[PDB]
Design a protein around this ligand. Structure first.
Ligand code: V7A
Ligand code: MG
Ligand code: MG
Ligand code: MG
Ligand code: MG
Ligand code: MG
Ligand code: MG
Ligand code: MG
Ligand code: MG
Ligand code: MG
Ligand code: MG
Ligand code: MG
Ligand code: MG
Ligand code: MG
Ligand code: MG
Ligand code: MG
Ligand code: MG
Ligand code: MG
Ligand code: MG
Ligand code: MG
Ligand code: MG
Ligand code: MG
Ligand code: MG
Ligand code: MG
Ligand code: MG
Ligand code: MG
Ligand code: MG
Ligand code: MG
Ligand code: MG
Ligand code: MG
Ligand code: MG
Ligand code: MG
Ligand code: MG
Ligand code: MG
Ligand code: MG
Ligand code: MG
Ligand code: MG
Ligand code: MG
Ligand code: MG
Ligand code: MG
Ligand code: MG
Ligand code: MG
Ligand code: MG
Ligand code: MG
Ligand code: MG
Ligand code: MG
Ligand code: MG
Ligand code: MG
Ligand code: MG
Ligand code: MG
Ligand code: MG
Ligand code: MG
Ligand code: MG
Ligand code: MG
Ligand code: MG
Ligand code: MG
Ligand code: MG
Ligand code: MG
Ligand code: MG
Ligand code: MG
Ligand code: MG
Ligand code: MG
Ligand code: MG
Ligand code: MG
Ligand code: MG
Ligand code: MG
Ligand code: MG
Ligand code: MG
Ligand code: MG
Ligand code: MG
Ligand code: MG
Ligand code: MG
Ligand code: MG
Ligand code: MG
Ligand code: MG
Ligand code: MG
Ligand code: MG
Ligand code: MG
Ligand code: MG
Ligand code: MG
Ligand code: MG
Ligand code: MG
Ligand code: MG
Ligand code: MG
Ligand code: MG
Ligand code: MG
Ligand code: MG
Ligand code: MG
Ligand code: MG
Ligand code: MG
Ligand code: MG
Ligand code: MG
Ligand code: MG
Ligand code: MG
Ligand code: MG
Ligand code: MG
Ligand code: MG
Ligand code: MG
Ligand code: MG
Ligand code: MG
Ligand code: MG
Ligand code: MG
Ligand code: MG
Ligand code: MG
Ligand code: MG
Ligand code: MG
Ligand code: MG
Ligand code: MG
Ligand code: MG
Ligand code: MG
Ligand code: MG
Ligand code: MG
Lengths: 44, 274
RNA sequence: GUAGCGAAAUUCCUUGUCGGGUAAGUUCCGACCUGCACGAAUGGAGUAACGAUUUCCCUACUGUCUCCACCAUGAACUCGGUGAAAUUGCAUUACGAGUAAAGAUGCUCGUUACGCGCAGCAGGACGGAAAGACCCCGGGACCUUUACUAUAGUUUGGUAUU
RNA sequence: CAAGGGUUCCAGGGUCAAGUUUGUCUGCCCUGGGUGAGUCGGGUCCUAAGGCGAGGCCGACAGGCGUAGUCGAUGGGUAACCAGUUGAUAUUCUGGUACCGGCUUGUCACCGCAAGCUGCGGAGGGACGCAGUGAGGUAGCUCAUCCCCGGUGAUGGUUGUCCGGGGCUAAGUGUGUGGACUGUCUGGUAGGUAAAUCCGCUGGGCGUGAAGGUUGAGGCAUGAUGGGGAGCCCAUGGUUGUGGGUGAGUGAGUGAUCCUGUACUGUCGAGAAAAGCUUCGUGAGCGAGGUGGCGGGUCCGCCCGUACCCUAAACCGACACUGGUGGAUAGGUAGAGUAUACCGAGGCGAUCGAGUGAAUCGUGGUGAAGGAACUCGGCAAAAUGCCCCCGUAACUUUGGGAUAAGGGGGACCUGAGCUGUCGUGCACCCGUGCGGUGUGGUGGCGGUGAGGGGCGCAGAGUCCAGGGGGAAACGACUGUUUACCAAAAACACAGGUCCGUGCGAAGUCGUAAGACGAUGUAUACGGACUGACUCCUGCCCGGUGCUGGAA
RNA sequence: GUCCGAACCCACUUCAGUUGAAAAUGGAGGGGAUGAGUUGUGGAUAGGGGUGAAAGGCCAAUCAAACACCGUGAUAGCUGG
């Protein structure tokens, strides 16, 4: 059937992209937390 | 007028439609249109603040001159009478005798070719716009300004009518279509005559679809909701509200006008009653 | 408690009573009113048309049935290849009448039974799957209100702005 | 093709793993290779929804909103086609022939408070719904005694039209047939943010009763002496390609979902924006007496994508999963059809098999007599089914009910006449040299056919394809709903009533500013209940609520 | 918001499946099919909140208050060890 994940690169980049995260202070703190943890992927 | 539909199909059975006899032109003036995207009843916060709004046929806004006093003394010919989807009245397209074209609410009785004018020395004819000090007492006007220079705000819908009853001092007393008696500044402008298309209220839409493309979404009455959704919600089987009638937000029925504002200019309340 | 309607999606008694339909009708349709406990915009009574709605009947039609038979196929079955699953205290795991935590393969007294497989059927192992969803007790959640205590909001007056 | 995937694509080597079996094979592994654009799809251009937002306003802080702006396609704008080639790429490379923008150059013509260029805006334009019919075309398709290239048949016949195949070419340019568009010459001018000679609004003169002009469905010409297109050659090389051998390009029927066409007609629910573009000036600067125009020549033309899968074994579903996935093309015969049956272009034989008349389960098939006796219940199945013609009840809101019900005919052979269209041809208007027009043609093709006839159990012979009637309850109706046990009598609904709201509306979101309501104004808006329509809607204000009043 | 009927959308009945081909489907029928239709792309509304032709429905395969992390080794007169 139609499943939950329907990919769209533009929507993904607008939602979880680096600039989207940098727009708000919550996203900036998320990037900081991922940097502290050591993720190689800071954002989508 | 109104044209009654024949009962060929259900939903067309009791319905009716205006015959559009007064329209002289089936297209609008291109230079007086702006885009009017739909809101769906949503706020600038993106939430529904006015319910029951959405969908409907696409519409283009017609720029209506509700001031009329920046063309004082310039006669205009009523070039056309045409349809405005944004209102229950018709719109008269006016060709001023200087090249400027404009739109007004079409007064009842005016048609293609008649000459309208604005100003204190304007003649008292339907469609002419004058200050209230110059409009004679006992006259039926429309498109009345609350504050001088603010533009038309009262008596604008189809068939609307305002009665000028007195001009004592620096205030003119007007009976609004609600029947309320109100005082306004004599310098406030008004257009002679009443609004046309007065018979549109008798239109039977006869069809859920016609309001659906008029832009009205279905209305779910609160008594068939759940208690979390509406104070009238709940109950086993069909019930009443289980309480006195209230709004979906728990506000009891009652007068809601702010008792302390411009009440010093209201002579008597509308007196709907029964 | 009016018009209207009434054993009704409402009638407990109840398969009320009478009438129609059937060879036979607790359902049905028309009546009666004795309305346990109808009723007029939480609308009353009707209503052509509409309905994958509910109910009754007639006709046509048939394997629905009397009453099943036969045919072909995908599994099943045999051979070669590949190869799981839930479950699992144990094992060389009968029946009868008993007995016992009151329903026994396992205890008593008897009876029967050579060892091991294959295809099958589901009576039992209180079979498997889900720390019963009913009940009660403890806790929680959400909902309600003329429960308590508060509060946003709305409103009153004072005072500052004055 | 898009989305998504990301090297799966190609060649060679490999068979541990993966593949529901095997495997020499692979979408697997290993190595190397493969994607070429001024025109295609995006960016360099434009805006929609929406996002962000200099200042700004609002908010203890954090922040909210928003102006000027600036982004943002799913839309607007925008110049190229055919053929050929590779193991893998092709509106990209190559061939042929075009187009667009620059730079530069040759030549001709022209300007000069007064060139031009660039900014800046004005106006025009871009620019818009839904539904329907018809007309003129073309694509396509069919047929052919016509033109080509073959064939003469394993078994009776098969050298005449008997059989098979083919009967082709683009963008661009020119032409201007249908069709469409369009009076002309001057004057004035409260408007178009600064202006306008470009617009708008108005005054006159003349004016066919259309005549020119402008335009451009197709056709023709050109592009094209080219390209493409079968079987004959010493030969090739023997699952091969080379050089010659390419032959034809006819006519009719039928006919679009395409073109004219945003046409035309109908219609209420009244159907984006902005830029490019044309023109107008000048609220800006540049700029010399140098530019700007029309034909001709040279060079310059950027970035990203381009392989491959893609109604799927490569995407979304943990799988190489009977599921889901937007768009384009979509031939023949029977048919109303994009249904269905069998076929075409093309692609597949499906990723464990071999057997064997067990019971049994699934999936189909048939059935004597009976025909709902089954069962909670006609559940399932059967019957009915198509077209044409005849005919059709209670009731009704006059529309319906209705395909009511209930009947007849259908295919095959032959076939008189009637028609669609074309036709060499007759005469004729000819504006002929018109790409024409009306009479008019033995005929070809197609459609339709009264009548007559044949055969069978059966002629809508297969697939496909309503059972019908009577009555009651509920809801008027079409719709909507518990994704994953309830589709209903529930919700909605059109209609109705009451209450609120005089506009900074009430109401709602928010701390606020603001916003929706609404660029609406009481014939409106918000809330409540009721729920088409018909006839109606009684009595009670004590209680509670609401409204008003204030001793 | 006509009728019959494909695509398309739906999900009424039945059978099968129910360690499925499939964490909701398949076969046979069935409803809508010019409309309150359906669908693509992008966008908006966010957790006591959204949205809801209203079923407490839906909000990333279990919603009478999502998910993740944190307070946190919550607490449990209860069950187990
Ligand atoms: C008519 O009486 N019969 C005997 C009962 C019954 C009959 C038919 C059914 O189809 C179901 C049930 C019981 C309910 C129980 C429900 C319950 N829940 C509502 C709290 C629950 O606890 C679970 C669960 N997941 O544990 C469920 O399954 C549940 O939701 C569900 O679906 C049910 C059913 O399907
Ligand atoms: Mg998801
Ligand atoms: Mg314009
Ligand atoms: Mg915001
Ligand atoms: Mg509403
Ligand atoms: Mg409106
Ligand atoms: Mg409910
Ligand atoms: Mg509440
Ligand atoms: Mg309630
Ligand atoms: Mg009750
Ligand atoms: Mg009885
Ligand atoms: Mg009883
Ligand atoms: Mg009886
Ligand atoms: Mg009453
Ligand atoms: Mg009542
Ligand atoms: Mg009642
Ligand atoms: Mg009712
Ligand atoms: Mg009733
Ligand atoms: Mg009825
Ligand atoms: Mg139904
Ligand atoms: Mg019978
Ligand atoms: Mg088998
Ligand atoms: Mg085996
Ligand atoms: Mg005992
Ligand atoms: Mg025993
Ligand atoms: Mg024993
Ligand atoms: Mg022992
Ligand atoms: Mg055994
Ligand atoms: Mg067995
Ligand atoms: Mg057993
Ligand atoms: Mg058990
Ligand atoms: Mg327990
Ligand atoms: Mg449970
Ligand atoms: Mg259970
Ligand atoms: Mg509690
Ligand atoms: Mg919970
Ligand atoms: Mg105060
Ligand atoms: Mg004070
Ligand atoms: Mg790629
Ligand atoms: Mg590789
Ligand atoms: Mg790979
Ligand atoms: Mg490969
Ligand atoms: Mg293997
Ligand atoms: Mg290999
Ligand atoms: Mg290989
Ligand atoms: Mg730019
Ligand atoms: Mg914007
Ligand atoms: Mg700032
Ligand atoms: Mg820009
Ligand atoms: Mg952009
Ligand atoms: Mg390729
Ligand atoms: Mg090519
Ligand atoms: Mg080339
Ligand atoms: Mg402009
Ligand atoms: Mg427009
Ligand atoms: Mg022979
Ligand atoms: Mg041929
Ligand atoms: Mg001027
Ligand atoms: Mg000016
Ligand atoms: Mg035609
Ligand atoms: Mg490529
Ligand atoms: Mg390719
Ligand atoms: Mg394909
Ligand atoms: Mg698949
Ligand atoms: Mg996968
Ligand atoms: Mg045919
Ligand atoms: Mg088919
Ligand atoms: Mg083939
Ligand atoms: Mg394929
Ligand atoms: Mg496989
Ligand atoms: Mg066997
Ligand atoms: Mg059968
Ligand atoms: Mg037989
Ligand atoms: Mg029989
Ligand atoms: Mg028989
Ligand atoms: Mg019979
Ligand atoms: Mg019986
Ligand atoms: Mg029986
Ligand atoms: Mg049935
Ligand atoms: Mg059948
Ligand atoms: Mg009829
Ligand atoms: Mg009939
Ligand atoms: Mg005949
Ligand atoms: Mg027959
Ligand atoms: Mg047929
Ligand atoms: Mg009755
Ligand atoms: Mg009854
Ligand atoms: Mg209904
Ligand atoms: Mg209704
Ligand atoms: Mg329905
Ligand atoms: Mg829906
Ligand atoms: Mg369901
Ligand atoms: Mg209403
Ligand atoms: Mg307010
Ligand atoms: Mg506003
Ligand atoms: Mg109701
Ligand atoms: Mg009283
Ligand atoms: Mg009272
Ligand atoms: Mg009071
Ligand atoms: Mg319909
Ligand atoms: Mg689809
Ligand atoms: Mg269901
Ligand atoms: Mg089952
Ligand atoms: Mg229907
Ligand atoms: Mg978004
Ligand atoms: Mg409930
Ligand atoms: Mg969910
Ligand atoms: Mg909570
Ligand atoms: Mg909620
Ligand atoms: Mg703590
Ligand atoms: Mg503990
Ligand atoms: Mg325990």
């Amino acid at each position: 059937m139609k499943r939950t994940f329907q990919p769209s690169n533009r929507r993904r980049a607008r939602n979880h992209g680096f600039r989207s995260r940098m727009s708000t202070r919550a996203g900036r703190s998320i990037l900081a937390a991922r940097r502290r943890k050591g993720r190689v992927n800071l954002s989508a | 007028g109104i044209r009654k539909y024949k009962p060929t199909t259900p939903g067309r059975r009791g319905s009716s439609v205006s015959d559009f006899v007064e329209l002289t032109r089936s297209t609008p003036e291109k230079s007086l249109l702006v885009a009017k995207p739909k809101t769906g009843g949503r706020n600038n916060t993106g939430r529904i603040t006015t319910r029951h709004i959405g969908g409907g046929h696409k519409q283009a806004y017609r720029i209506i001159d509700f001031k009329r006093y920046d063309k004082d003394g310039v006669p205009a010919k009523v070039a056309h009478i045409e349809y405005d989807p944004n209102r229950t009245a018709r719109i008269a397209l006016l060709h001023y005798a200087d090249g400027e074209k404009r739109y007004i609410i079409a007064p009842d009785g005016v048609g293609q070719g008649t000459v309208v004018v604005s100003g204190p020395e304007a003649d008292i004819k339907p469609g002419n716009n004058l200050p209230l000090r110059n409009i004679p007492v006992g006259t039926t006007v429309h498109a009345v300004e609350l504050r001088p220079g603010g533009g038309a705000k009262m008596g604008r819908s189809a068939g609307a009518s305002v009665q000028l009853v007195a001009r004592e001092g620096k205030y003119a007393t007007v009976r609004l279509p609600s029947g309320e008696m109100r005082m306004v500044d004599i310098r406030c402008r008004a257009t002679i005559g009443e609004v046309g298309n007065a018979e549109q209220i008798n239109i039977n839409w006869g069809k859920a679809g016609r309001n659906r493309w008029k832009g009205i979404r279905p209305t779910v009455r609160g008594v068939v909701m759940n208690p979390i959704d509406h104070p009238h919600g709940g109950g086993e089987g069909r019930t009443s509200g289980g309480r006195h009638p209230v709004s979906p937000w728990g506000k009891p029925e009652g007068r809601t006008r702010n008792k302390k504002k411009a009440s010093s200019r209201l002579i008597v309340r509308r007196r709907k009653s029964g």
